[PDB]
Amino acid sequence: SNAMLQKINRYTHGFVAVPVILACREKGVFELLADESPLSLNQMVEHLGANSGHFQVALRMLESLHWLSRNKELKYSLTAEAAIHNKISEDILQLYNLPIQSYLEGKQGNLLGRWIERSCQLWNLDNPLMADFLDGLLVIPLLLALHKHNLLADSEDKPLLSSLSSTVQEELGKLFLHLGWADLTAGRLTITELGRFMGERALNTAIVASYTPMLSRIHDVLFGNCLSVFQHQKYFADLEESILSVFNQLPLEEQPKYITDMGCGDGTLLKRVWETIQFKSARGKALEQYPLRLIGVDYNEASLKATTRTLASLPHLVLQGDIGNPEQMVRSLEAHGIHDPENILHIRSFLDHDRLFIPPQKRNELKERAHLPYQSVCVDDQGELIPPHVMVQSLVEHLERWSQVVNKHGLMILEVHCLEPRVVYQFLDKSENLHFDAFQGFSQQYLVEAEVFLMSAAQVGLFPKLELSKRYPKTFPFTRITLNYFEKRPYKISHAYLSDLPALVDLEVKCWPENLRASTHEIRRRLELNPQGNLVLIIEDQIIGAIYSQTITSTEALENVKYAQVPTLHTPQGSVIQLLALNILPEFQARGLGNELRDFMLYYCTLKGGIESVVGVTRCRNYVNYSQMPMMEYLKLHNEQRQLLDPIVGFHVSGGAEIRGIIANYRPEDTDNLGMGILIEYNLRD
Ligand SMILES: Nc1ncnc2c1ncn2[C@@H]1O[C@H](CSCC[C@H](N)C(=O)O)[C@@H](O)[C@H]1O
Ligand SMILES: [Mn+2]
């Protein structure tokens, strides 16, 4: 269940969170903020000799645990939750190196008797949340060890933990009883489905228990010589879903002839792709006439030979490569005798954030974004903090290198993303961000928000086929992983900056008559107050589209206001997005640009998080030819197809919006429709 994964999540939360809390407590982070409370990042890193980059990662984690509040001046303060640091006894760090492999084999004595008593005791803590963190340090190593021999199973053919010495039985039983992994029914231990499930999924946390050495020198990472030191399966299920779609397309003639996975690793991804294609798709039934060659790419020869072994009975090829240089790939593929790169489907899985960092190259594009409120945290080889806007700018030119190699078959990219501390806390144990974000930042990997990554592709002409693109975690209001099947499109989409006001005013006049143009004052307001609420569609360096939006407290706040008082609907902590306007030059209408721009903005607002719906008040264009009938009977009309007659309301409704009501005298100056504005809402379903 999700609830059990949450228990797993908070076990692995402490595995990472505890070393750093202790490290911060020893250098005096908490004692400091006990004084001089309001402090900046730079204020502290100077007063502590910290590595600003890695130390910021610690702050994000601590804020995400709501031990620190970060004010609008960006300075931190303690919270009441932060007082519990005093009772985390230091010696718990000894858990990371105990010989539990041998222990289960009966050759370490009563190794885990003193801890298990302290875990049965609430680690002498009056806080169940931290007691689960501490339990992690014991729990994580055990499950890994218990998993090498599937030791956690019910008591039918192997009575639960019956192969083991008397003491191991006694100690583990006392523990599994405390943690609820087993019940002593009928005077004999029998696992609980929690215990069973805790042992089955035991490898989710274990796999990333490889953080141990960095965690042991985490005090170095934060305050000393940091330089010396350096799991859903439906991620891939949906990835396979979109592969079938690609290899069931109309003519086999036009399916990709190559599938190149950047970041082969062991090659498991490629092999799963081929079996999906082999046994399920249409291509799999015509491989003798339309061969398909897998291609593996990776910069470590180690994993290059691991995929030669994995793909060994499969038509494949292997070569060395790097994400940062997609142009060497076509040339290496040229060297390996592939002269039709346009017939390659490109895929990759969770590596763009592990690219070798290039500094940003287009300094004007750097400064446009230097005020946007990114909440990426990233660290340089010197251990200092990289400004978010530099990283994102870096990301864009990284994506542009690839956009210039992407072909008709597109670019299918899974990727992982970080989260705002305020959101991590709200969903602390529903997501694994706290430890994953904390480590991937300590490890000099580069995580950005999902909305920002998708935007980064947008600004270079890469756009997700929303049909084959999926978001995760599906049923929560945050995006932590994205499956995007980026298409290359002949345009670009980007944020509107104040520099764009001249053209956006010119835009507003070419799209509407004077009595319907948006006030220049309004447009200025939209840009200044909604930096990430304004999307622009650029073709050949000119703006040809623009969708405006802001955040509102509710749809009920709207539906009770006139167009003139919209600016007074703005609420920064709103759970709904107001669609302010959708302007497309008449020269370039009837092309789908407006349709695509609309679809993109909706998905952009889904990845931001915390937005249940997108609503707006639109106009009718052809009521003035039917005004004899009421609006509501006109809105009911249908064109030659099964779509609404009116092209404006038609456009939003076809795009999935539902007409929610009519607003009387919303736009009085709109004489054609008698001042009536038609409210709309978009599903926005997960
Ligand atoms: N910058 C880069 N360019 C290309 N491949 C990269 C890369 N950085 C890392 N990789 C690849 O990503 C993979 C590491 S993850 C593979 C390990 C495997 N999943 C396991 O758990 O056992 C390796 O193939 C490595 O070569
Ligand atoms: Mn990584």
UniProtKB/TrEMBL annotation:
GO terms for molecular function: 8-amino-7-oxononanoate synthase activity; metal ion binding; phosphopantetheine binding; pyridoxal phosphate binding. S-adenosyl-L-homocysteine binds at G265, D298, D322. It comes from the Bacteria. Its cofactor is pyridoxal 5'-phosphate. Residues 491-681 form the N-acetyltransferase domain. The keyword Disulfide bond does not apply. Keywords: Metal-binding, Phosphopantetheine, Phosphoprotein, Pyridoxal phosphate, Transferase. This is Polyketide synthase-related protein. It comes from Cylindrospermopsis raciborskii T3. The chain holds residues 1 to 705 of 1245 of the full protein.
